[PDB]
Symmetry: D2
Subunit: 485 residues, 4 copies
C-alpha cells in the first residue's frame, strides 16, 4: 500500500477548447485557434490535422455525464478553464500607452468591473455557472484556470501574423493583450469566486511562446518563426501573469498559481550534469525566478511588480528530456523523451506512447522535488497522462506516476493533489482527435463515454486514497516484448 | 448492455496439478506428470521447460486468499478437480480380465466403497473437504471434476513407456486404469456429494491421447509416438468416462458431464466447407457420438453401456483452427489458430497471445451453437482465457468471448455459465510458469496475488450479470498497430 | 532475360549542391539553399537537419574517383547540373529593356555581344573546373545530359530568410521575373560555353517541387518556407516561363535536344470508384504543367501563349513511388499510409515495404507514368531519377531490378524511352533531411570520403554491362520479402 | 584490403542428401533419413516438415550447371560427400572375424582381395555417375575434399522408425559396432576407387550432431529420435572408433591427408564470472571428442587407446554462431535468447540480428574457434562450413564478409587455415526443417531447378577472384543494421 494524506485529492484536468465543443449549440468560432485549425493553407501544409474541434467530445452540453463518471470514479478535484472568447467575443473599447515595454500596473476597480460586465456574453456566463455548480455538487474541489491557449480573434489574428503582417491583432506580441488579460482574469474571479477553490492564471505559457514562434513544425498559432518575437511573447505573458495575479487578488483572497509544462532533464552520460542545470535554467528557473523573485532580463534586473506573484505551482509532466554538453552549451537528444518514434521503444529501450513520448515516471519525482527545494511553494500535479487509445500502457503509466508523487511527499515536498490528463479523450491541438488521453474513451460519432480498464484502476486509487496492495505491480514499466518496436 | 439470465453464473476453472503446489506441505510427487517434468532427459531435450510445479502458486495452502478474491470479484461458480494421486498414492490390490478390450461394467457397491476407504489418504481427503467448504461458504456453485491429467505413478510410469517398455504401469493404454478410474470417481462422489453441485468426469481427454501419443513435441507424458496407441488410449478413456458416469450415478442424483478441448474449425476459402465438417467429425463428433449415442468404432457399432452417459457438455475454447481440403482429406494450416508466432499477428492480421494463439471470439459462438444443434445438452463454458502477463489483450479477450456466449444464448443454446481460465497464473504443463493466464498475477517468490486490470473488468461483468454499457467497447479486437508484429 | 535496345543507356543522376562539396576548396556559400540550411532559426525549428553540405561527398575534388567507379560499373550516361551560384556568385547589372512589373516574359533577347558581356562576370575558376569534370566524364564514354538548374539560386537572386520572415522587399527568387530573365541568360550562356561537351540539355529539375514545397509543403523545410497558395502559383507561373525562355536561349546557341526533368508520382485509385480522382490528380500535378510548355495552354482566365507552345524536345521522368487518391465532394484527396506518406522502415497500409524515407515500394507506377506521358505527348523520355533511401542495401537490389523491368515493359508497349539513370551513384546531401537518407549505389564514408560498393552496385554492373536484366538476377524482379523487415 | 595467402582457397560445401535429388532418376529411397522424413507419424507430430528431398535442387542431374556457376564465381575448392546408400543399397555379407558383442573395434583388416570382393556388391551406375560429377568438378580447377559420411546411413544398417519405437532388435545404426566395421570398409573402398580425383579426405561431417540430436535433442526431429543419455554416449563412442578405423582404412590405400568435420560453437561467458563455465563447455562439446581421436584419450574409467591416438591430419571447422553459458552449482548451462536459441528474424537478447533460423550474428566466434583449435593441437584447418539461412539476402553480404575477415584475423594470429568453404553454393534440403531454410549463395527455384545469383554471390565472386576482401566491399565487415529489420 502507498497511502496518501487524508487531504490529498485525486482528479483530472481538461481544457475548454479541447473538450467543450461537439454538441450542437457549443460552437465557438471566435478564437485564434479555431481560425488556425480551419485554415485552408495550414491544412494543405499538414500543420494542422484537418480534424475540427466542433466535432469534439461535447463537454459544453454533456458535462453532467462527465461529472457523473468522475464522481463514480471517486475523483475529488477538477481543473478547468473558462474560454476568454466565449465571455468576450467582441472587441472592447481601447482603454494606456501601447509603445511602453513594461506593464507594471493595471488599475481595476468595482466600477471598471461593472463596465466590463456590460460587454460580457451572459448566456456563456450563465452556462459556465451551471457547469461549475454541477461540478461542486459532486464534491469536487475546483481549480479554475483563466487561460489555456486560445485568444479572442479580436486580440489575435494568427493567419495575418503567420503571413508576416504585424499591423493587426498580434496576440502575446502586444501589451494590449497583457492589459486585457489582467482585466479578464479579475472579472472572472469577480463573477465566480463563490464557486472557485483555487485559481491558476494560465496553462503552459512556455509552450505558447515556444511552439508559437520557434517550434513551428508543431502547427501552433501563429507559426511565425522568430527567436526575437518568441522572447517578446514570453516577456508579455510573464507580465500578464503578474497583472492577472494582482487582478484576482483585488477581488479574492483565494490561492492564485500558474500551470507550467515541465520536463525532467536527464544527463546522457555522467559528464553532462552541468548541461542538465543549464537546461533547467533555460526552460524552468528563468521563468519562475521572474514571477516569484522578480528576476528578469529586459540587462538583468529585479521588477517589484513581478516579485512574489505566486501562491502555488501546477506541475504538468509527461516525460524526460535527455541532454548533453556542447562547446556552445547543451543540446537535447532525439530518440528519448518527447522525441521518439510512436508506438515503439526509445534509445534506452523504454516504451513510447501513441504520441512517441517515452515512459519515465522518475522524472516526476525529480521535477516535484526540484521545485520544492528551490521555492518551497506547494504544488498540484496538474497534468500527467499518456496518448494510448488501446489502454496497453496507461494502467502502468498511471500507477507508476502516482507512486512517484507519493515518493515526493515522502521526501518532504508539499504536493496536494494529482490531476490526470484527462478524464476523457479530447481534441489534441494540431494533432486532432487521434491522440487519445482519456481515462474514458470517446466515441466521437455518438459522444458516448466508455471506461478503459485504466479508469477502473484509477477508481481503486481515488476511492482508497492509495495505490492499493492489489494494483501495486502496476508500478513498473509496461513489458516491451509484446509491444511494437 | 448485454444482460445474462438471472440463473447464469460467472466464475473460473483451475486444475489441481497446475495450482495446488507452491506452499510447503503441498508437494505431491506421486504422479506421472510430476515424474515427467522432473525427468533429466526430458529437461535436456527441452520437452519440458525445467520449471517445477512445487514452486507453484500454492492453492493448497492459500486457497482462502484465492476464494476471498473470487468473492470480491463477484464470481458465483468454480470448477476444480481432486488429484487422484493425493487420495490414493499407493497401489490398490489387483481387483477382472485385463486382456478383454471392452469394459462394459464395473460393479461398485457400499461394501466395495468402504474397502476403498481404508486405502485412501485421510489427510488429503480432509484438506479437500476444508478447501471445498470454504469455497461453498463464499456462495460459489461447485463443479467437481474427477480428472485433469496426472495419474498416480502406480497406474502410469511415463518414462518407461517413453523408452518403449510396455511391461510396467501403462496409464490409459491399460483397462486396469479404466477400472480404477470408475472406482475412484464413484468414491469421490461418495465422499463429497454433500458439497458438490455438478460433476465432470474428466478434462480434455482428447488432449491426453492426442498430445501424449501423437503431438510428441508438446512434451506431454508419455511422449510415445504411435497412431495405434493413441487410438487405444482414447478408446480406454471413452470407456472410463462411461464407467465413471455409472459409478457417480450409483451414489449421486446430481448432473454428470465432461469437459473437452474444442477448436472452431474454419474454412481457408469458400471451397473448404466440407473440410470443416470432416475436421469436426474427426476432432469432436466421433467422441461425443460415442458417449451420447453409443456409436463407436472398435468395425462401426453401438455399445449400450456407452449410450446416454452424459448430462452436460463443458466447452473449453481458446481459438480457431483453419482447415483446407486435400486429395487425401483435409489439413490444418500453420499461421492461424494455435499455430501462430507468439506476440505477433496471424496470417489473417489478428493479434496472437504470449502462447501464439490467435484472437477469434466468433469461434466460441460457432462451437456452442454446433453442440447445441447436434445434441441439445446444456453447456458451461468451462475454459476460456489467454496467456497474457502484460494484460494488453485480456480485457478485449474477456469481453469479446463473454459477448459471444450472450450471442449463443440469444440464438437458443442452453449455456449456464462462463468460467474463465483462470483466476490466477499457474503451472502451464510442459511450458512451465511463463504462460500466465490469470485474471490475477502471481508473484511466485511470495505467492502474492495481484489484480490485473482485466480482473477489475471481470468484476464489472460478474457483479452486474452483464457486459455493462461502460465496457462494451472492449467487445472488439485488440488494436494491432501498437502491438508487436 | 530482359534485353534492352542497343542504343539504350544505363547510368545515374546527381545534383551539384547535394554532391559537390566536401573536399578542401569546394565550398559554395552563395545560394539560398546554403544560407537556408545554416540558418539558426531553421535549425532550432527542426526545419533542417543541422547537417551541412560542406561536409559532403566531395565530388568537386573527387570526381575522377566517382567516374572511375561509374566506368567499372559499365555506366554509359550521366546527368549532372552546373550550379548557377558558382558561375555568377555576384549580381549582374540591372538589365536592358526590362520592366519588372509585367507579368509575362515572352521574350529575352540574347546575342553574341550579350554573351561576351556575361562572360566578363563569370567565375573563370569554376568554369574551368566544370570543364575539367565534364571532360573527364566524356573520356569514360559517358553520354552527357547537362541540366541547368537543380534548386539552389544565387543569394543575389533570393534571400530565403527574408522571405520566410514575410519581407518581400529583397531578392525574392522565383517570385520575381528578374529571376526568369536571368535564368534565360544563364542557360544560354552555359550552353554557349559547354556545347562541345554536352549531348542533351535539361533546363530544370523538379520545378513542381521548388514551388510546391517552397510555398505550400512548408514542413518539408524547403526555402523560403513561406506558406501561400497565391505565391506558389506565382512561383510556378514564373518557373514555366523561365523554362520556355531558357529553351529559346539554349536553342539560340545550340542544335541539341532540350528537355526538362519533373517530379512524378503514379496516381492510383483507393477503390474501383476513384478512377476519376486519379484523372483529376494527374491534371493537377502533371498535365497542367506539361500542357503549358508543350501546347502553350496556361491559366493567368485560360489562354494559349505562343511563346510557351512547343518548348520541349524530351521528358525526364523522376519516379520513386505512388500516390493513392480517393474521390471527395470537393474533388479528391491523397491518402496517408501509402506512397511517400508512410512510416520509415515499415510497411504501407497495402503491406508493401517502405524505405528509410518512408516511401512505398511500387515499381508498377513507373510503367504507368512512362506510358501515360508517351500516350499524351509522344515525346521520347529518359528515366532521369529512380532510387531508394536504403543505407543497409536490404531493398535496393529488388528496387533496382524491378524498376528497370518496368522500363523494359514500357518500351515493349511502344513508349520511346532511351535510358535509365539511377538516383544516385553515391550517397549525398538529401536537402532538409541531411546525410541520413542514403540513396547511393555506392556508400559514402563522410569522414574519409571513401566510396564503397553496396551489393546493389554489383547488381547494377550486371545490368549495365549486359544491357539486360540477365537470367541470373531476374528473381530480384519482385517485392522485398516483408517478413524479415521491420513493421 | 584484407589479402589472403596465395595458396588459400575460397569455395563451398554441400551434402549428398541435401542437394542430389530433384532431377528424374536421382531418387535414393534407401537411407534412414529418407524413411525418416517420409514417415506418417513423424509428419503428423511435426518432427519433420513434410517437405521431401526428392523435390530438391537436383545436383545429381544438374551438377554441370552448379560447377559452371561456382567457376564463374571464382571458387577454387569444394567439399562434397558420396552417399553410402547409393554405393551399397543392399546388405553386405555378415563379415569375417567379427564379434558384435565386443565394445571396442581396435582393428578392421582390409586388403586388396577384400576390396575386390566389396567391388562385386557396389552399384556401378552410382559409382560411374559420381566419377562423372567429380571429373567435371576437377576440370573447373576445383581442389576436392571428399567426405565419406554426411548423416544418412543405408537402411540395412539403420531402421530409425523401429528404434524410435523402442525396438532394438533390428538394424540400429551407430548403436551397433557392425556399422563401425562397415564404415571402415566403405571409406577404404571409396578412397580405393576415387583417390585419383581426391585432394584431401574427411571421414565424417558433424558426428557430434548425429549423436547429440539423434538421442538427446529429440525435438529437432533427427533419426532415430530416441531419447537416452546412455545411448547417445554409446553412439558417440562408436562414431569415434568408426572415425579411427576409417582413417586407417583410407591410409591403407592412400597417402593423402585425412581429417574430420565437426559442428562448432563459440562458447561465450554471460558475465565476467563465467570464464570457467566456457572452459567446461569447451571440454564437454569439443575437446573430449578431439582428445580421443588425436591423443587417444577416452572414457569407457578414463583410458588411452593406442588404436585411436594420432588418427587426424586436419580439422574441418563448421561454424555458424555462439553459445552463451553461465556457471551453475551443478556446472554450467547454455542460455536461450543467444546463439542458435533465438527467435527467427529478430534480435538476440544482446541486440544482434538473427537469421531465418533464429541464429545470432557473431563473427568473432569464428576467430575464437579457429585459434583455440590451433593452440591446442596445431593441426591445420579449413573452415568447412559457414553461412546463414537468409532467403531475402538481407544479412548474408555482411555475414560472409565479416566471417571471411575473422579467418584473415586467425591466419594473422598464426593459425594455419587453408580455405573457406561457404555453406552453401545453392539452397538445399535443410534436414527436418525442409526447403524453407535457404542457405545458398544461389537461390533455387524448386519448380524449375533454375539457379539465381543472390547479391551475396556477386560479393563472394569479388572475394574469390581477388583472394581478398577488397577495399570496395570492406564496409560489409560489420553487423547488419538492425533498425530496418524485424524485432
Amino acid at each position: 500500500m502507498y497511502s496518501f494524506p487524508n487531504s490529498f485529492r485525486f482528479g483530472w484536468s481538461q481544457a475548454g477548447f479541447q473538450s467543450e465543443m461537439g454538441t450542437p449549440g457549443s460552437e465557438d468560432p471566435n478564437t485564434d485557434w479555431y481560425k488556425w485549425v480551419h485554415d485552408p493553407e495550414n491544412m494543405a501544409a499538414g500543420l494542422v490535422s484537418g480534424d475540427l474541434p466542433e466535432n469534439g467530445p461535447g463537454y459544453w452540453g454533456n458535462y453532467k455525464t462527465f461529472h457523473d463518471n468522475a464522481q463514480k470514479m471517486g475523483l475529488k478535484i477538477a481543473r478547468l478553464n473558462v474560454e476568454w472568447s466565449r465571455i468576450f467575443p467582441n472587441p472592447l473599447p481601447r482603454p494606456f500607452d501601447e509603445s511602453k515595454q513594461d506593464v507594471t500596473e493595471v488599475e481595476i476597480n468595482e466600477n471598471e468591473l461593472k463596465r466590463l460586465d456590460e460587454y460580457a456574453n451572459k448566456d456563456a456566463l450563465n452556462h459556465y455557472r451551471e457547469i461549475f455548480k454541477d461540478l461542486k455538487s459532486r464534491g469536487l474541489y475546483f481549480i479554475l484556470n483563466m487561460y489555456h491557449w486560445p485568444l479572442p480573434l479580436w486580440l489575435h489574428d494568427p493567419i495575418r501574423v503567420r503571413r508576416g503582417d504585424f499591423t493587426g491583432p498580434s496576440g502575446w506580441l502586444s501589451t494590449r493583450t497583457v492589459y486585457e488579460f489582467a482585466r479578464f482574469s479579475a472579472y472572472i474571479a469577480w463573477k465566480f469566486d463563490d464557486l472557485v477553490d483555487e485559481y491558476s492564471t494560465m496553462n503552459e505559457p512556455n509552450v505558447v511562446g515556444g511552439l508559437g514562434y520557434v517550434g513551428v513544425k508543431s502547427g501552433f498559432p501563429p507559426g511565425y518563426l522568430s527567436f526575437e518575437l518568441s522572447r517578446r511573447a514570453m516577456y508579455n505573458i510573464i507580465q500578464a501573469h503578474a497583472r492577472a495575479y494582482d487582478g484576482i487578488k483585488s477581488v479574492s483572497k483565494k490561492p492564485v498559481g500558474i500551470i507550467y509544462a515541465n520536463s525532467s532533464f536527464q544527463p546522457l552520460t555522467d559528464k553532462d550534469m552541468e548541461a542538465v542545470e543549464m537546461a533547467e535554467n533555460d526552460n524552468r528557473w528563468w521563468f519562475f525566478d521572474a514571477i516569484i523573485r522578480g528576476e528578469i532580463t529586459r540587462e538583468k534586473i529585479v521588477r517589484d511588480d513581478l516579485k512574489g506573484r505566486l501562491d502555488w505551482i501546477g506541475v504538468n509532466y509527461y516525460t524526460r528530456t535527455v541532454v548533453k554538453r556542447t562547446e556552445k552549451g547543451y543540446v537535447s537528444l532525439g530518440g528519448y523523451g518527447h522525441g521518439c518514434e510512436r508506438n515503439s521503444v526509445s534509445l534506452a529501450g523504454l516504451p513510447t506512447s501513441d504520441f512517441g513520448w517515452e515512459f519515465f515516471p522518475e522524472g516526476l519525482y525529480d521535477v516535484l522535488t526540484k521545485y520544492w527545494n528551490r521555492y518551497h511553494l506547494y504544488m498540484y500535479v496538474t497534468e500527467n497522462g499518456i496518448a494510448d487509445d488501446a489502454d496497453y500502457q496507461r494502467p502502468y503509466y498511471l500507477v507508476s506516476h502516482v507512486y512517484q508523487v507519493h515518493r515526493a511527499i515522502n521526501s518532504g515536498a508539499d504536493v496536494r493533489g494529482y490531476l490526470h490528463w484527462s478524464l476523457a479523450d479530447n481534441y489534441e491541438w494540431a494533432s486532432g482527435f487521434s491522440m487519445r488521453f482519456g481515462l474514458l474513451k470517446v466515441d466521437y460519432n455518438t459522444k458516448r463515454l466508455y471506461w478503459r480498464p485504466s479508469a477502473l484502476v484509477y477508481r481503486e486509487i481515488a476511492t482508497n486514497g492509495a495505490i492499493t496492495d492489489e494494483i501495486e505491480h502496476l508500478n513498473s514499466v509496461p513489458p516491451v516484448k509484446p509491444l511494437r518496436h
